[PDB]
Write a protein that binds this ligand. Structure first.
Ligand code: HEM
Ligand SMILES: CCCN(CCOc1c(Cl)cc(Cl)cc1Cl)C(=O)n1ccnc1
Length: 528
């Protein structure tokens, strides 16, 4: 007789529901806390699952330590478990595969196994708009990248270089942070100057003179509002109604509206040349199945393409300025390269001459090695994936996290990895290179192997298409900085540590350097 025991299950439940509000709250906390803990212990039994990092608080998982110092988190985990391990992150299970094998396993994964758009769309679609990037099937993305690459050709870069140079000089002339016709020395915050210099140079050359002229007005404020939707807090709550969410949505309509306006006027005048990305997409945005991109979609694609490049590039020139500020030896060497290639300054900077500045391109390369703008790249796992040479299975619904930026900082692949050393790239100054066989996903032949320990631009179907644009812009900018200014730190200041909490891993500010003119009496012409 134990039906008598079932009587007391019933009675027991009855007394549960009758406990005071204090104990019941105490229990709605202690009961998932405990379940979680035995669940992990039970989980670590399975040999077909990668090791899972232990955590106390349910749902939150390892969010706090990962969110604040993800490379230290990765390293500590790698010591305990090796290169494959999992951890819970605000609701989700992230499986990290560290090292070159990890790049291979994730970047070169089969289309059917993983989805970038499933990982990213909830974050990007509201910022950029509907119908493009991650708000469309992968095949559509592939053709958009193709369309955009058509405004990123060598001949495009030859015409961008003087426009970008004009903008840097205008900024030296007019911005309160410099004013080189009035001041010979000054303090700047690189996280104030570099985003402005970036948006100004990127706008003028990819969007055109009209759009660049709008940045001189209050309209510029909308791009900032748009940033606030592109944060690792929309990370988790994609849409819950308070005000910076509205300003985001408002900015998107307003900016896309403006782009659509210029598009429609250019077509109404047949004022369609080869100046911009705008001209380019208007002439070339028909998918292979014959469907044309709408004017809304084109405008949304413009926002998305310029947003990403804006923050990665601005963060990178800020890090460059910061590393160089304590290396007058490297400024000196870069300066000598400038005098030699540009014949004392008597040659005008062109895209061709940029390619003959290996030490400048190595400086960019090395900065990107020590400061990858994105410490983590994600895919949602769509089908149970087996991990080669293990018994590990990664179930659908998990996420895979790859981190080439972590490998960038390993001594095994980069001797003295925490040292800024541009000469480690002697006779290897290329932004990237395919050491063999290629493949084409729809936007041109890129490398098939994604095993390089140096992968600032990722690889596989989702690979960056902006690398050459970014070197062009960073190149021109840094060439003018070097030729015009020397700079150094305020007393006792040094290279700041990264802030990893933002979307990109910019430096912890205020990040200030002191500039001074190389030629105090040099004037920059033009009306203002
Ligand atoms: C230093 C500058 C940059 C760095 C380090 C960088 C890095 C990256 C990385 C790592 C990815 C791959 C993301 C993933 O696989 O999850 C990517 C993708 C991409 N980037 Fe860049 N990027 C930079 C600048 C730019 C610029 C200037 C542009 C445009 C002109 C651009 C446009 C794109 C596009 C369209 C993708 C495709 C993403 C996809 O297919 O899912 N990026 N970038
Ligand atoms: C253009 C579509 C979104 N992208 C590409 C994917 O960007 C990412 C990356 Cl690389 C990581 C995470 Cl965590 C989220 C997003 Cl949206 C960009 O804005 N970027 C950023 C740098 N280069 C391009």
């Amino acid at each position: 007789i134990v039906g008598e025991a079932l009587e007391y299950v019933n009675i027991g439940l009855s007394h549960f529901l009758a406990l005071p509000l204090a104990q019941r709250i105490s229990l709605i906390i202690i009961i998932p806390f405990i379940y979680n803990i035995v669940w992990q212990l039970l989980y670590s039994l399975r040999k077909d699952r990668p090791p899972l990092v232990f955590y106390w608080i349910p749902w939150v998982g390892s969010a706090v330590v990962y969110g604040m110092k993800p490379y230290e988190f990765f390293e500590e985990c790698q010591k305990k478990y090796g290169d494959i391990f999992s951890f819970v992150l605000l609701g989700r299970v992230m499986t990290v595969y560290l090292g070159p094998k990890g790049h291979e396993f994730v970047f070169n994964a089969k289309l059917a196994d993983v989805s970038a758009e499933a990982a990213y769309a909830h974050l990007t679609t509201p910022v950029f708009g509907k119908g493009v990037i991650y708000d469309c099937p992968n095949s559509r993305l592939m053709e958009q990248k193709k369309f955009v690459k058509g405004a990123l050709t060598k001949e495009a870069f030859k015409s961008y270089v003087p426009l970008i140079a004009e903008e840097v000089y205008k900024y030296f002339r007019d911005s309160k942070n410099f004013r080189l016709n009035e001041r010979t020395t000054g303090t700047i915050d690189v996280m104030v100057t570099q985003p402005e210099m970036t948006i100004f140079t990127a706008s003028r050359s990819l969007l055109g003179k009209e759009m660049r002229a709008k940045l001189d007005t209050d309209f510029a404020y909308l791009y900032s509002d748009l940033d606030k939707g592109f944060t690792p807090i929309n990370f988790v709550f994609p849409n819950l109604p308070l005000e910076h969410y509205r300003k985001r949505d408002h900015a998107q309509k307003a900016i896309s509206g403006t782009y659509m306006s210029l598009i429609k006027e250019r077509r109404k005048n047949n004022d369609i040349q080869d100046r911009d990305l705008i001209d380019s997409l208007m002439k070339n945005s028909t998918y292979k199945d014959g469907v044309k991109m709408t004017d809304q979609e084109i405008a949304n694609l413009l926002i998305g393409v310029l947003m990403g490049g804006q923050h990665t590039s601005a963060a990178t020139s800020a890090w460059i300025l910061l590393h160089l500020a304590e290396r007058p030896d490297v400024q000196q060497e870069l300066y000598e390269e400038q005098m030699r290639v540009l014949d004392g300054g008597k040659k005008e900077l062109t895209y061709d001459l940029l390619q003959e500045m290996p030490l400048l391109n190595q400086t960019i390369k090395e900065t990107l090695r020590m400061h990858h703008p994105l410490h983590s790249l994600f895919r949602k796992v769509m089908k149970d994936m087996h991990v080669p040479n293990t018994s590990y299975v990664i179930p659908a619904g998990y996420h895979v996290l790859v981190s080439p930026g972590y490998t960038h900082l390993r001594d095994e692949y980069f001797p003295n990895a925490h040292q800024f050393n541009i000469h480690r790239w002697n006779n290897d100054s290329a932004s990237s290179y395919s050491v063999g066989e290629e493949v084409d996903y729809g936007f041109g032949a890129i490398s098939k192997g994604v095993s390089s320990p140096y992968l600032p631009f990722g690889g596989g179907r989702h690979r960056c298409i902006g690398e050459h644009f970014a070197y062009c812009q960073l190149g021109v900018l840094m060439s003018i900085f070097i030729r015009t200014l020397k700079w150094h730190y305020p007393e006792g200041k040094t290279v700041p540590p990264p802030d990893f909490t933002s979307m990109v891993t910019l430096p912890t500010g205020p990040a200030k350097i002191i500039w001074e003119k190389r030629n105090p009496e040099q004037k920059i012409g033009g009306r203002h």
